[PDB]
Design a binder for this molecule. Sequence first.
Ligand code: BS6
Length: 125
Amino acid sequence: MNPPPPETSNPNKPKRQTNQLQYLLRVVLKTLWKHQFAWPFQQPVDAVKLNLPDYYKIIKTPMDMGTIKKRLENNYYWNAQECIQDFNTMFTNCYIYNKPGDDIVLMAEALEKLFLQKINELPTE
Ligand SMILES: COc1ccccc1S(=O)(=O)Nc1ccc2c3c(cc(N4CCN(C)CC4)nc13)C(=O)N2C
């Protein structure tokens, strides 16, 4: 069964638009989005559709690129490090729930290296 998806807007949370956050959306996210391995991560895990009834029994802080994309489109974040922590959560979630060598983990590991490649150098203020 599926918990509610993570929030993509929060009116009591202060918004911010930084050069780095614009970067994370326009180059980092949108390039990762197109990767041949991105598709499992473009939406919250649907534990019913994917027959992963134990996913949200194991994963207590779900995160996906679809959630990150909408948070970025809504200036949900205060700074880029907040966004980068969401990406890191998505990857570590995948490593927690699965085990080394699974196809999904091979996909996450590849995306993580592309992600770490692209955030090595961010714009400045
Ligand atoms: C088996 O399925 C897939 C395998 C590879 C790619 C895509 C699918 S998928 O699109 O069919 N399903 C999934 C989509 C998204 C996820 C998972 C994760 C683990 C996982 N499993 C690992 C194997 N195990 C026997 C079943 C559960 N499957 C999916 C997981 O961390 N994420 C975020």
